[PDB]
Design a protein around this ligand. Structure first.
Ligand SMILES: N[C@@H](Cc1c[nH]c2ccccc12)C(=O)O
Ligand SMILES: N[C@@H](Cc1c[nH]c2ccccc12)C(=O)O
Ligand code: NA
Ligand code: NA
Lengths: 386, 383
């Protein structure tokens, strides 16, 4: 439930029952033979795992520093690592006898992944989405609709991701007997930060074997972008006990840290309690403060408790990258390696490039390439221009 | 060079030298140990091969007949099978000492695949694209520029794919010393229909191994959509000598075969020489007729000569599906399996659905799901 001081279950008593039931089911199924057979089979045949680990030789040579490898989560079905979590939890839901999935989304990407897994497993899917986000993510909303899901605009509060999570929890209180709340990152009340991390850990287990195969040793650094923290947790977690492996999380610096238009909770936020967890949040009077990133998956005012924990014990370092740096990295990866990254992933690429220049040519960086940039084309067209 | 009577090399003198140099380079490198190390490496670590073979359980049970498996070329880097050919020909070009790629595109999908492969290997890339297609494919155009390619609008003729291929050929004649012309499907003069089919055959080889693992037998039917024919040849070719495996190719029926708006060359075209090859072409006083499909990859007025051959010897059957049926299958796959298919691929899905209803529950159909539908979201929305 806790990662040091961070985590917990700060919810009304009406959620205690659904959360206890989910904990019990997960403890039962997580190591179950049949559950893991089916999950692996879907991950393989439907999602396309394993993803490759790709040596970005041109990019490495251009920078003239450490070797840069990309863990190619951009190749998973759906175009992002979120699918690994959507399948794991949807399958758990199905083993729990649930017939409906609900989920929040802000960028839309989780909503799509949820819709895809619910279509796969024959479940009803309802997606809560703040109205400001719906307006800004018309194509992802359309994807969710083609996939058979219903999108429910949330008009309360600030009409964004924080408010969609709050509305989804209210729904789950009334519907948990047949509904599973499929949370999209390593956030929320226990057992969600644990479960989502466990479903994303496949990324690091694969990357560890692949890098051993490619280079005969562990990497010197692993770099991942941090919104809520699930792609980073998925790649970090199997290297947590390999003490020589540096772990770097990259937050959204937005228009700059001193601009106030960023989303860097670990860098600039303060301890707080929302959405059932004690973690770092960006807040003013204890209110959640508006956040921004050019990468819409990075725009959440909190961060997962397990990251707060790794930061506190100094197991992992957390840095920031601006919108402009990320954008430059997005263009550079496209032109240099023929890989169009998600703007989220482009944050991690931008930090890696900086980092590589300072290291020696026999050192190794693995970047988690959390998604592909098709979803971002409209935004990049508007901001970069034609 | 020929498939039965089809194919060939019917080009001006000025194209002979480039084609014969390509053909020698191909002979040299196709089985070369280093060339195949490099190919396999890029296909694995950059493209993501192998792609999985997926049992479409919900769809199969709903229809109630044959089991439907999908060969998931939607999961290749770039979201379509074109990447296999783009890699293989770009790498060839690189081994030949070329520094530049040119390529035609209509739908923009080949233009993107070529741009990606050029970027990967550090080549210059110029894409020839009919002005008509440029205006309908804003996002693919954008993709190509992000990948560092240049897009050259073509304003001659009808300003569509056939004209792009013409201009690319004219450029290649001038530039082949340092440029490779990376053609997009199993069409053109020898050795292109062979080279493209050889670089797609990986699809069939994987699918063969994968269906044996899954079901312990070969399939009853393999179904693929057919524009120029490359995804279909890639999946068919390794099964050509397995005499019990039926091969079905699905052409764009457009607004109906009666309607004048379709791209069903094998089904309603006539044999003719165009783009250096004898094959089936849709023709009016003998000029190449305008063509149409909702799936922009299926709108070439010709078809690859290896298909013309397979049809003639009756080793494969060719059918058509309309725009309407393809769009219904696009929606059905999305809702039932959580896979949004390319509108090209949705033609094969739509036919496999029809076929499956008529077949037994222990029979097996493999559909080549040649692409994902992200690229098609604008046009499906705009509808
Ligand atoms: N907004 C993103 C990522 C996301 C989903 N749920 C979250 C919860 C916390 C932080 C980020 C997220 C999306 O919906 O695709
Ligand atoms: N027009 C499609 C497919 C294509 C490329 N070249 C071709 C030649 C023949 C037939 C089809 C094609 C594209 O460009 O992506
Ligand atoms: Na944050
Ligand atoms: Na045709």
């Amino acid at each position: 439930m806790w990662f040091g001081e961070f985590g917990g279950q700060y919810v009304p008593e009406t959620l205690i029952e659904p959360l206890k039931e989910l904990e019990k089911a997960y403890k039962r199924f997580k190591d179950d033979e049949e559950f893991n057979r089916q999950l692996n089979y879907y991950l393989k045949t439907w999602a396309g795992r394993p993803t490759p680990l790709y040596y970005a030789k041109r990019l490495t040579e251009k920078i003239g520093g450490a070797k840069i490898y990309l863990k190619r989560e951009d190749l998973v079905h759906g175009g992002a690592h979120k699918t690994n979590n959507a399948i794991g939890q949807a399958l758990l839901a199905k083993f729990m006898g649930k017939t409906r999935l609900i989920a929040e989304t802000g960028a839309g990407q989780h909503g799509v992944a949820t819709a895809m897994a619910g279509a796969l497993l024959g479940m009803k899917v309802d997606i809560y989405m703040g109205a400001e986000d719906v307006e800004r993510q018309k194509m992802n909303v359309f994807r969710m609709k083609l996939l058979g899901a219903n999108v429910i605009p949330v008009n309360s509060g600030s009409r964004t991701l924080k408010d969609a999570i709050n509305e989804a929890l209210r729904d789950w209180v009334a519907t948990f007997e047949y509904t599973h709340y499929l949370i999209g990152s390593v956030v929320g009340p226990h057992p969600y930060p644990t479960i989502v991390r466990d479903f994303q850990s496949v990324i690091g287990r694969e990357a560890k074997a692949q890098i051993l195969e490619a280079e005969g040793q562990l990497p010197d650094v692993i770099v991942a972008c941090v919104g809520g923290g699930s792609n980073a947790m998925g790649i970090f977690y199997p290297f947590v006990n390999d003490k020589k492996v540096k772990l770097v999380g990259v937050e959204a610096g937005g228009k700059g840290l001193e601009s106030g238009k960023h989303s860097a909770s670990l860098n600039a936020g303060q301890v707080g309690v929302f959405h059932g967890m004690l973690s770092y949040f960006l807040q003013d009077e204890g209110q959640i403060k508006p956040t921004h990133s050019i990468a819409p998956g990075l725009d959440y005012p909190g961060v997962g408790p397990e990251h707060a924990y790794l930061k506190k014990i100094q197991r992992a370092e957390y840095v920031t990258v601006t919108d402009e740096e990320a954008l430059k990295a997005f263009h550079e990866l496209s032109r240099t390696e023929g890989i169009i990254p998600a703007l989220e992933s482009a944050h991690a690429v931008a930090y890696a490039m900086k980092l590589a220049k300072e290291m020696s040519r026999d050192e190794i960086i693995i970047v988690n390439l959390s998604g592909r940039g098709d979803k971002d084309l409209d935004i990049v067209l508007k901001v970069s221009g034609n």
